[PDB]
């Protein structure tokens, strides 16, 4: 169960531009591939995963030969430990020889959109809440959210774009929870809707800043537990417009203020006893329910989906090749991926991407290397998962 949230009123700042509230844009990165190994003819899912960005407004459009994509599904968005928000576009098709598909990108951060084409070619627990309040002058109320993580998996989440917005659970486990949990989790959820809302309206005054842009608070609160249950870490740390602004120190007793207007609400919460009040719910109310939700589901939380993993064969300039070696299917998403020449791990001549979503709950990831053609079989790529017996070791197979 989320806390209920103390209002940050603050009150004036100094437009200093330290790093605390205000624009300051991150570019989205992208990526886009497909669910499933491409076979022409082969209905598919052409994934564009888009990470790193900041606002958290954006659009997305997937193209087929240059032209739009009418149906193009959304998967709900998120954010990072770095308060960097991420999100999954995806759509049906049935890729061929020669149709190309590309991922638009349209936000603030960028002078334009930016085009990305497909090329087929290349122990503890936690339970954490995230919570994103973003204003939208002109386009309504400001839009609030509060997902929460056991163990980083989303199992709860509050939307009020919704129409009789309530909290709904997100992983099957949770449906053990009876009418009273949700309509409390619900009303709570309303409550701190508010406080948000005047916080925002706060900050402008605080900051300086116009009554018509957008501006986001957003706050990671929770707690870490140990094996036996004990508290190992507790959280709760606020960011505005995508900087950190206020935290709680690793005492519980303390605040670290990252600028001016922060002050403000440090001090406010010294004389309120606010870090007080959070200690008390994260040593107690935050593990008492985090136990509770592991008794639903820490089963389902430590499933493991071993990858699947083979090696590809590609050409380079001259005397080249590219091996690129596939991770696919695994759960949950931590991995790693290393070639080796003759028992050394490489660093230099080798490319990764991000781990990345399927779609269908199982992640991806590949590793390449740049070798001489005709040096193939004196590389081996080395596959390491929690799910797998051993490591995975394996080698360009002709």
Known sequence: S????????????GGGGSGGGGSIQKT??????????????????LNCYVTQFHPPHIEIQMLKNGKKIPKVEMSDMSFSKDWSFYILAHTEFTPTETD??????????????????????????????????????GLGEPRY????????????????????????????????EGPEYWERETQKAKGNEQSFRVDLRT???????????????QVISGCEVGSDGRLLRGYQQYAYDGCDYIALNEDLKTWTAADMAALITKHKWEQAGEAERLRAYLEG??????????KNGNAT???????????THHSRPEDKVTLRCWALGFYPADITLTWQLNGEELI???????????????????????????????????????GLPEPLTLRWEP
Not at 2 to 13: H, P, R, T
Not at 285 to 294: F, G, I, N, P, S
């Open 348 to 386: 230099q001549d080798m490319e990764l991407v991000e781990t990345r979503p399927a779609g269908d709950g199982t992640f991806q990831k590949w590793a390449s290397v740049v070798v001489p053609l005709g040096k193939e079989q004196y590389y081996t790529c080395h596959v390491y998962h929690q």
């Open 301 to 311: 939380l430590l499933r493991t989906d071993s990858p699947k993993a083979h090696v």
């Open 100 to 137: 190309t598909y590309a991922c638009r990108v349209k936000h603030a951060s960028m002078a334009e959109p930016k085009t990305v084409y497909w090329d087929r070619d290349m122990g503890p627990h936690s339970l954490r809440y995230f919570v994103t309040a973003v204003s939208r002058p």
């Open 2 to 13: 989320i806390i209920n949230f103390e209002k940050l009123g603050g009150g004036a700042s």
């Open 145 to 176: 959210m509060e997902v929460g993580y056991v163990d980083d998996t989303e199992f709860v989440r509050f939307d009020s774009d919704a129409e009789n917005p309530r909290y709904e659970p997100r992983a099957r486990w949770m449906e053990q």
């Open 203 to 217: 900050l402008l005054g605080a900051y300086n800043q116009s009554k018509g842009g957008s501006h986001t608070i």
């Open 28 to 45: 989205p990165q992208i990526q886009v591939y497909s669910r499933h190994p491409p076979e022409n003819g082969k209905p598919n899912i």
């Open 285 to 294: 109310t935050c593990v008492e329910w985090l136990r509770r939700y592991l």
